[PDB]
Amino acid sequence: PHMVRSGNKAAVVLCMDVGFTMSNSIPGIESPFEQAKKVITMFVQRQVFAENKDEIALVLFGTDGTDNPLSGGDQYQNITVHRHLMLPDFDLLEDIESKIQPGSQQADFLDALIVSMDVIQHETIGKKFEKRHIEIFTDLSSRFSKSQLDIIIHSLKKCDISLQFFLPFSLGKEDGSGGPFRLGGHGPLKGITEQQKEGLEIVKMVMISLEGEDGLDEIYSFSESLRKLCVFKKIERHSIHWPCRLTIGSNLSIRIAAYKSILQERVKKTWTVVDAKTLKKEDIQKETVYCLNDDDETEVLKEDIIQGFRYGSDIVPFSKVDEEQMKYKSEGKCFSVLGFCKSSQVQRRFFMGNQVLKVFAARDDEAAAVALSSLIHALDDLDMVAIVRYAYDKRANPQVGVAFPHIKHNYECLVYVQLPFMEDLRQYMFSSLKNSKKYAPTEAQLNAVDALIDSMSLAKKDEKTDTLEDLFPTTKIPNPRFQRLFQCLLHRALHPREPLPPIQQHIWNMLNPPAEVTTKSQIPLSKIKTLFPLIEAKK
Amino acid sequence: MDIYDDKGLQTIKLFNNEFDCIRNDIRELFKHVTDSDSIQLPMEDNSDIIENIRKILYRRLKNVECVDIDSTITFMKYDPNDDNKRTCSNWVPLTNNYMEYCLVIYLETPICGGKIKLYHPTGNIKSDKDIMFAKTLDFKSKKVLTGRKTIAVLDISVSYNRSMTTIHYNDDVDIDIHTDKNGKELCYCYITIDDHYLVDVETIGVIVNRSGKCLLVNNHLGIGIVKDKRISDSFGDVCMDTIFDFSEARELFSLTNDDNRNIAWDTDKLDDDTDIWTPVTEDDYKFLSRLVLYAKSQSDTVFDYYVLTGDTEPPTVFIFKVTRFYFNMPK
Amino acid sequence: MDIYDDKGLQTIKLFNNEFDCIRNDIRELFKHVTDSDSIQLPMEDNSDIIENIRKILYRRLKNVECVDIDSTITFMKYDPNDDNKRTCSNWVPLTNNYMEYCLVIYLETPICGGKIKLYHPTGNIKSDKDIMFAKTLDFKSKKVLTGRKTIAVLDISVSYNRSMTTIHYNDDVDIDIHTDKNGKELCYCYITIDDHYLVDVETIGVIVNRSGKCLLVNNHLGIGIVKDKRISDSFGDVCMDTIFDFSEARELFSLTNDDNRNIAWDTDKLDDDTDIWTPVTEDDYKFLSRLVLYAKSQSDTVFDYYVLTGDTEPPTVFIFKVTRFYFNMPK
Amino acid sequence: SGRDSLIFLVDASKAMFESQSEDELTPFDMSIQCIQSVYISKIISSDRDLLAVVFYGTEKDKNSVNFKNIYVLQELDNPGAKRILELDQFKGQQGQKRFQDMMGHGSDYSLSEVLWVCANLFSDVQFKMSHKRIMLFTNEDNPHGNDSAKASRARTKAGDLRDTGIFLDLMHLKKPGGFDISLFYRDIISIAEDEDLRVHFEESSKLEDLLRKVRAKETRKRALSRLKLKLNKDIVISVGIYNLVQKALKPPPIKLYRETNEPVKTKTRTFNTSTGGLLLPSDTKRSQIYGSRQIILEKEETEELKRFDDPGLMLMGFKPLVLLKKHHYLRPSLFVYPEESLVIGSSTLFSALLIKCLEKEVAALCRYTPRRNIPPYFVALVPQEEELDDQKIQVTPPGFQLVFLPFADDKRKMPFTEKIMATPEQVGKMKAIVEKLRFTYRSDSFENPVLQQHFRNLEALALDLMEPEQAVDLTLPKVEAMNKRLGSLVDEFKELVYPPDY
């Protein structure tokens, strides 16, 4: 399966502080300038190497010069527009890498927001954009005015402009504070100054006004930004729906739209084999030869081989077959309920396919929404799932799958996952381990394993709330292959005479559990090592 | 010179260097004349030259299906004292793509006068060469004034390819259906949509004028939908409002052809916005039903491929099998 | 009435009622003339009439690729006292699909006489209606007995498409390229494929015989690829071998047409394989180069769509732009 | 090695034709249908195994060395259409009559002679020798109870056959009064460890359970890989990874030379155009075009940019099972079992981990790298306890379920939707409809229609017959049955839910 999207682009303005305070050092943490550079580089790398149509502008504030269209003398000073709205390229990446330098001045970030708004308003008149976004990378360590505030908000609601904020610190509450410092890992309210607190209050007020309580979820830190897909959250697009009718019998039909919820992301481009010197594909010929079953080197024509099928110990030639004969004439695209069954009967290990579908009611259909809600709630109440037949179109091979209810506070739907046929099941037999005298663990070994499992827990219960918190959610972590590939490609494009750089530290940090688990597990691991003999075979 | 009428059917054919390889044999056949004003010789015995002229006509005529020559040659001698029209050259073909011709091959050509004259109320033809003319035209053998004019006459029946059809509109007037566009104002397209996961309609039918406006006539349930009189500005609008089961298709993508082609007029120039023809009288509905039936009959043998593209990422492609018929309408 | 020459070009055209909605406008335009028997306006007045004439010529002609109309419009009035023959100073065109014409629309038709006479070796045409004749021909305006005769003259240049062309095989015999399958055996196909996520080869040239055998000619690397003599039994396997040379795509799927349509023919049956044509001489390579050059020259405006289906999960559809030419190789 | 050898031994005694119910499958028909199903499964799976069918207890004999009451119907060869048809000749009452006419159905036999004939069948094959096994279909638990001399010889011959290397499995069918294995067998059948002492199958009564038992004891388990599970850099155990589910694809056509029909190799070569010749692997480079910019990498660098960790499984921690979502499915799961042949002591640690993970209801979150130079994926090892049905068939193997977890890039955005709730009356009507259409789901309840149609066409062609009769798809809902069951509830649900205008 592949993702098909609408075809709408977005305009994104990156507002970056380059002021004096965004250069301070500390023995163990990078300066906020470098972290903002890393986040911006990651965003632009993904935009460039995926060949998207989104247009990106870059506005620096805190610079030593002034190149903004609102200067007018003694106003909006030290704000430069380093790049206007256009498709990103390698020149922008080189500029981010080794052309943009820290400044020696300070600028109000609300004036920078005004300049970014002006860029969005006056540079999108001739073009079409479905989303307008501003990402602000600041540290909130400069004096600011509050006069224009209200006007700002009004504009942000008149022109429909979204905002995201990135800061050197997080927005956690009662975090409790806590070897070497690691960036990008999963694991400081007293470390900020009063001006930072005032800036944080104003940022919170703007975010609450624009969106609400959920707006507080759109304030991130650079460290957590490097290990999430948050910078792409407001410019992502969903797939084109699959329209059909859920049929229970031949008299009940519900108009439904299906969307792809899970689908593996793959590299879009491959590597082309080219000549060493000319660096062109035309200097390479790939010809296949069917050299019989020996080295006779007999000339073979393309029509000499007639092809055929195998049915065990016999061969049915292609000359005795017809295209119309072996063709399963499908009845068409369908979504039909074969039956309802207990949820315990359908197990997870039998899930098949390479996609998960979410089924909603058809857009602008109140009756369909009511009917689908009734079906979902009945299934949830009775603890049952619908075994259904699924056909993508009149050419796709029909499959049998399971649809189960999915109720949330903001939406409700069905979830479709494929199920196996008889031919896909392998009936192996394995020896029982619990009933084995040869491999029966002792009590001490069981105690050691219990201690190991206790010390390596990745969850924590909330304080008298019965809520489980995940200390290592891997589902929010991006695939490291894409960032590593982008880094290597950019390094090759900008440093042709250099070897590929090593893997960045923050990728390793985000691929590893918190250091607390590793610290806790050291002693039970030693006990397990001293209790379980493990000798390699000497064949 | 291929003389073509308004119906595309050849009427007059003049040859100069085409029968020079046959005249000697034809004269050798001619000597068996003994005091006959207009002699007739059956060619059931000497049918070789019949085959030779058949081969020549097959080679030098366009869009030929069958040539049925008659096995009789009529030799006529013309003297300085003669004047003939027969004044009764009226004859209506029974079918559409078939025609009977008279073939005159000159044996002894007059040196000065007495050519053959062919009449038609848009121009007149006078010729003194090997001629082949339909039986629907009045002809004159002009009064020769010197020598003698000895000619040979064959009878020819030719059936061409079926590029012409007739449909009855009312008692008085009928309508002509043509496979190709030439001075035709209206085009009917019978469309079968290839299987796509977004398309919920199999077959449709539209009428398009040169302005590009489209009127839906049939949706595989008959011609009932033409009663609603749904008119769209183009074919993309017809697809947007007809073949998609969801609510707002225009919000998801836009349909266009990447080669600037039209479903009916190909790479032509659409006119400015004009009124679109719609059926008002029961005769119009009967004609529309007949046209839809005929188009459905031929939809499995003749059709072409049309492609529409939706600006998705990746782009979506819709494939249509189109059967087109071009026609005119009375004022 | 349509008149064509041996090469296939159109030389004369006779209009019955085509110029009727413009005669009143031209008459109104000729009210603004004071004492001028022959007067030329290099203004066109309102260009609406020029656009109307351009559209009429576009619609009621064949294979028109472009139309150019001079701005000057001449008007000529004839008296029963003066008339003479005007030859054309042997105007010869340069390119073989282009001709300049003279168009005459009658503002006042004489009661007697006043007929345009065109001279050609095959015959002479005498007409009394609106006409359009090539500037190559020689013409005369006959004397008027009763009444007056006022006509309008415009200069129009049009370009055509040359449905049939010629390729010089040698110094003695040159063969003819036809756009229709009727009577032809060998078919050259120039195939292009649009953007796709599984296609890496764009252009392929394939020669197909009536038995379905296909031979590669060009794949944008030149014509020398015909030296390997890659002969296959279907276009799908040719596409798999050449256009789908990817390692993952080798043992992946197969290509087929759901409508049982071939590239060379639509529904004609395939005869049993007997032999496959192959260039054995030296001038055959020049032949192939000329054919490829002509096909590439005309590939930006003349093409049709072809559809193939690949059995993947889900199955995919591939669209090809094809330019087809038909010919018979003399033996 | 590579070709497994399996011999189907079917008893031809009288009691195999007794059916205790007028509408029931006789044991002989059960055995024939099971063998036919095994043949069909082997052909569909394209498994190159050797199968033989031998009848003992008949009145006619066809064995090589002249022995009485032993008929070798089919020797060792690959499955085919003609053998399947010949087996089909014996199915049903007419098939029973045909078999009782071609052979006998009552005689005196010696198990020693039968096993000797089967051993000679094993010896006659010269292609490959690996995994020889004899499956006995019978419902007589005391074959030589009145002849101790024959019983001792049978025990001795079974012992020597077992020392040679041939496995002996029993497929005992239903008997009046129960089947007692301890009476005469347990001295012949192969027993390894304790899996054949207390975990032995029960007597078969139907076709489905007998088929499952036959396929369970004949299919050798093949491991995709033998990775290393590393609790840390020092404690490393050896495990095997299996695919208990795998999509069945329609076999692609093969290329055969015109001279007879022979498989032909498909070689690939690289030519440098005019110069020609086998281009060296170090004479090529890899390129990528972005806009108008070309990026050039060597093949080694292309492999290096994909390299994160060494192959194996690296433990990251332990997570509660409630934190794993069913709608986060990415790709089919795998199965993890201990492997004692590589690291000694792996089974004990594996068992301890399984027991404790089942007790505490935790899954092991690990990092997974299958091969060299492959980016990692986060996986969850979910503990899985052993489950047996009433027939003592292992429906669930003990071990770990390797569940693939999605990355952030594999999760797609959903469009905004307004939550529309349904009144309790509509939900109740829907509950009534749902209950009226309740059925039991089994993992082996549906068959792929395209595969079945393809192989039916192939079988019809290989037998030189015409196109086969189409069969009704079993994955298509029975609309009429559902409509009759639902009755009027659909109309009332539509009245409550669907407005009259639309």
CSV table of N, CA and C in Angstrom, one decimal, chain A residues 16 20 57-58 70 101 128 157 258 343 371 390 407 423-424 458 468:
chain,number,residue,atom,x,y,z
A,16,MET,N,14.1,32.7,14.4
A,16,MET,CA,15.3,32.2,15.2
A,16,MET,C,15.9,33.4,15.9
A,20,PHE,N,22.7,37.8,21.8
A,20,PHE,CA,23.9,37.6,22.7
A,20,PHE,C,23.6,36.5,23.6
A,57,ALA,N,10.5,30.2,4.9
A,57,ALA,CA,11.3,31.5,5.1
A,57,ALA,C,12.0,31.4,6.4
A,58,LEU,N,13.1,32.2,6.5
A,58,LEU,CA,13.9,32.2,7.8
A,58,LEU,C,14.1,33.7,8.2
A,70,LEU,N,9.9,46.5,7.7
A,70,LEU,CA,9.2,47.4,8.7
A,70,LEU,C,10.2,48.2,9.5
A,101,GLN,N,26.0,33.4,11.8
A,101,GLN,CA,26.9,33.5,13.0
A,101,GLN,C,26.1,34.1,14.1
A,128,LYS,N,-1.1,29.8,-3.5
A,128,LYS,CA,-2.1,29.1,-2.7
A,128,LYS,C,-1.5,28.3,-1.7
A,157,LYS,N,-5.5,35.3,14.5
A,157,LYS,CA,-6.8,34.6,14.3
A,157,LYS,C,-7.5,35.1,13.0
A,258,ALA,N,-12.6,5.1,4.9
A,258,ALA,CA,-11.5,4.5,5.6
A,258,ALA,C,-10.2,5.2,5.3
A,343,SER,N,-14.4,-11.1,21.3
A,343,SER,CA,-13.1,-10.5,21.1
A,343,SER,C,-11.9,-11.4,21.5
A,371,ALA,N,-25.6,5.6,12.7
A,371,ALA,CA,-25.6,4.1,12.6
A,371,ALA,C,-24.3,3.5,13.0
A,390,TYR,N,-13.0,-7.8,2.9
A,390,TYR,CA,-12.4,-6.5,2.4
A,390,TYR,C,-11.9,-6.7,1.0
A,407,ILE,N,-13.2,3.7,20.8
A,407,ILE,CA,-13.9,4.8,21.3
A,407,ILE,C,-12.9,5.7,22.1
A,423,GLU,N,-4.0,-21.4,4.2
A,423,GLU,CA,-2.7,-21.6,3.6
A,423,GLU,C,-1.6,-20.9,4.3
A,424,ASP,N,-1.9,-19.9,5.1
A,424,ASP,CA,-0.8,-19.0,5.7
A,424,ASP,C,-0.4,-19.5,7.1
A,458,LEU,N,10.0,-0.1,32.9
A,458,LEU,CA,9.9,1.1,32.1
A,458,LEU,C,8.6,1.8,32.3
A,468,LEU,N,-0.7,4.8,34.9
A,468,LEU,CA,0.6,4.2,34.5
A,468,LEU,C,1.3,5.2,33.5
